[PDB]
């Protein structure tokens, strides 16, 4: 509604970067006329001339001599437009936001290809915070996102968390701190946003339901604060009906959402993309504009290509493939933790995602039984310290993958674990 | 000699994030061991399988099935270590720096890949500026370079410039309103660097000279402020004898260098990179690890196998293909000038680069005389008011790209230029 106030002065402060302002009016209007007002580099200097690449369940994709050209070349900075074009009518299929017909100031819902979705991630918590400013937020949580926050000087407040993610009435209890209308007033320092992940918590696996969605957006409205979803296990989830999103609730345009192809498609390809209310997607790009620039041309070719030809259709189907693949890699590490750990252990299955987070009973610690006991007996698993604020506090849990071990090497590494804690113990 | 006073206390906080740390006791010491520590996705599942992409002037480049696996996932925050080990060799041989073998702690030569190389001049940026500190440029100036800066609400002083670059009298009567030891007070607010593009500057075509370098390095030295060379046409010299660079000289380690690939090998793959002190480097590192992760893997291996068939004998044999196309073109844009704006305007002839930087005789701002009779009479070129920090003041200056046109379309594009200049004269 009043989107100036998630806006640091430094980000409303960006201005536009002309590499398109003089380079517009040549498509239409004169389409006889010279302009040597580009910055652009001749492309035919560049040694790659074209390129095949061979794909599974897919036609081969085939950059001919034009398309190569216009892969080695600069792009928009949001992204090229018909993958833009693409992801905005799987956002309208999977989530029908409310916002897609808004007008810009009021949330109108916009994307932005970006280099990897935590790419998208860092600039809106740059966007956001000034030192001092309070966020909410669920631990354990993702370390690369607690690495993230921790220069930008904010005051990261803990929301309770339980199986089924997020506890609304933790958040409620958090909230009663303030008055709803704190939020309008500059002296009060309401939090900012809401940040978590709502399928598959990196390192718990746990999810957050649809009940308890509809409670957090209502308590976000009330004290009017963002969310941030961070979904790069949206296409991960082992229920196959997906919860509904954030953001297909979003009648205020409050939710920035970060979707990733990182697991799905590719992580080294450095493509993801966020989905939000114009104003505050429009400060990203303009912090793009002065950085990165753009997304890798080839890159979003390559998935723009493999995407229109698979279709909605082929693309849900290579989903439930690789959903197929890790539910079994899933079942496989429960039974190998079933095995073993019975007794020595205590864990929730996971309802998303590709890890297991596994409490060891009868010790503090297990930083030391793991890191200590590691070149000797073979096995390596990473203490859960890192997941949270305060690394240096103890932790007797473990963050065990099963993205790729096969079920003999899980049972080594779970028969190697159970007799360390049963002589640690 | 103290990096401490060139980071933010921001930049100073960050830590390292861990997708290394408990990934890093796997090659050696235990060779046989499990390991369910990691967070990399299962690469099986990626869609893309093989790559063939046909090079001009080198051997086809092949992805098989183990490396197409590897250029789908996620590499290491700096560069993939084959590219970083041979752009290590080509700096030592293109520059030979001083600071090879310094102790990291006084600024041993460390290598960043980034994602184009405006990423890494960013994040320096980012890495160093506190609102009101001053900085040290000569306009005009790169206008991303200048958006870039603005937000971060540092106080811009204009060094005067000339047709050798930067003026290093006007540097030392800037820096003559400091005493040397002012660097060294918390109160003073000495410049923290000084920006500049030493070849083919954009917009101006000019290059500083080997005798203005070491004067205005030592003006560095005796008030300590950092040198960031942004030398993206450093490979584009029409001289083929290059002019000794600020990384080569800089015995104290106060350069940071940024180099790209843009214009001579890719600007859509998005990779450049930096040289610089290791502590500043490592700060700009860390920063990557929580935003972009790391540059394209897919897009380094294409790079890094290209430059390693070549050598330093192929790539330098196509940097010269390409000076040779440029200076060509520059010379056809001159013949253009010669025959048409001959006493309506003056301009310099570019010593790099690829634009040709025009004053419009009689007339206080071209602004009008271009985007005005633009549709009108079908020629586009770009006024020179972005180029300044006071974009708003009127300018009778014009950039020309000659990266593209052929002679005909610059001799017709400087006729129609030259009828406007004499009707609105």
Same mark, same amino acid.
């Not at 718990?204 to 979803?229: H, M, P, Q, V, W």
């Not at 190998?336 to 009868?362: N, Q």
């Not at 849990?397 to 071990?405: D, G, N, P, T, W």
């Given at each position: ?252 345009? #409050? *939710? +920035?959402?970060?979707? $990733?192809?990182? =697991? ?9 993309? @966020? %989905? &939000? ?43 439930? #493939? *690789? +959903?197929?693949?890790? $539910?079994?890699? =899933? ?9 073993? @750990? %019975? &007794? ?44 949270? *604020? ?36």
């Amino acid at each position: 509604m009043n989107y100036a106030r998630f806006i640091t002065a430094a980000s409303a402060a960006r201005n536009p970067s002309p590499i398109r302002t003089m380079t517009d009016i040549l498509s239409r209007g004169p389409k006889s006329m010279i302009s040597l007002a580009g910055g652009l580099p001749n492309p035919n200097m560049f040694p790659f001339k074209t390129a095949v690449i061979t794909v599974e369940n897919g036609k081969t994709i085939q950059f001919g001599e034009e398309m190569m050209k216009r892969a080695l070349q600069y792009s928009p900075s949001a992204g090229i437009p018909e993958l833009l074009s693409w992801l905005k009518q799987l956002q309208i299929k999977l989530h029908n936001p409310p916002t897609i017909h808004y007008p810009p100031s009021q949330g109108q819902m916009d994307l932005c290809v970006t280099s990897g979705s935590q790419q998208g991630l860092c600039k809106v918590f740059e966007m956001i915070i000034n030192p001092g400013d309070n966020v909410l937020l669920d631990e354990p949580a993702y370390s690369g996102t607690l690495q993230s926050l921790h220069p930008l000087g904010c005051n990261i407040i803990n929301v309770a968390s339980d199986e089924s993610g997020i506890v609304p009435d933790s958040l409620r209890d958090i909230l009663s701190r303030w008055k709803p209308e704190d939020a309008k007033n500059p002296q009060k320092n309401t939090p900012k946003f809401l940040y978590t992940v709502p399928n598959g918590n990196n390192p718990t696996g746990n999810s957050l339901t649809s009940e308890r969605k509809k409670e957090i957006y209502e308590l976000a409205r009330k004290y009017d604060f963002l969310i941030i979803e961070d979904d790069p296990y949206y296409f991960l989830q082992f229920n196959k009906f997906r919860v509904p999103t954030f953001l297909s609730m979003d009648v205020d345009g #409050r *939710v +920035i959402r970060a979707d $990733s192809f990182s =697991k799905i498609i590719s992580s080294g390809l450095r493509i993801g993309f @966020l %989905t &939000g209310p114009k104003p505050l997607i429009e400060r990203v790009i303009l912090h793009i504009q002065v950085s990165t620039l753009h997304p890798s041309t080839f890159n979003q070719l390559m998935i723009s290509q493999l995407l229109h030809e698979w279709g909605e259709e082929g693309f849900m189907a290579h989903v439930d #493939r *690789v +959903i197929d693949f890790y $539910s079994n890699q =899933k079942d496989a590490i429960l039974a190998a933790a079933d095995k073993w @750990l %019975t &007794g020595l252990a205590e864990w929730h299955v996971p309802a998303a995602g590709m890890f297991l987070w596994i409490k060891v009973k009868g010790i503090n610690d297990v930083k030391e039984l793991i890191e200590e006991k590691a070149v000797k007996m073979g096995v390596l698993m990473l203490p859960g310290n890192a997941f949270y *604020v305060d690394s240096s506090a103890p932790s007797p849990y473990l963050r065990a993958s099963f993205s790729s071990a096969s079920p003999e090497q899980m049972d080594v590494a779970f028969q190697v674990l159970a007799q360390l804690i049963k002589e640690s113990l």
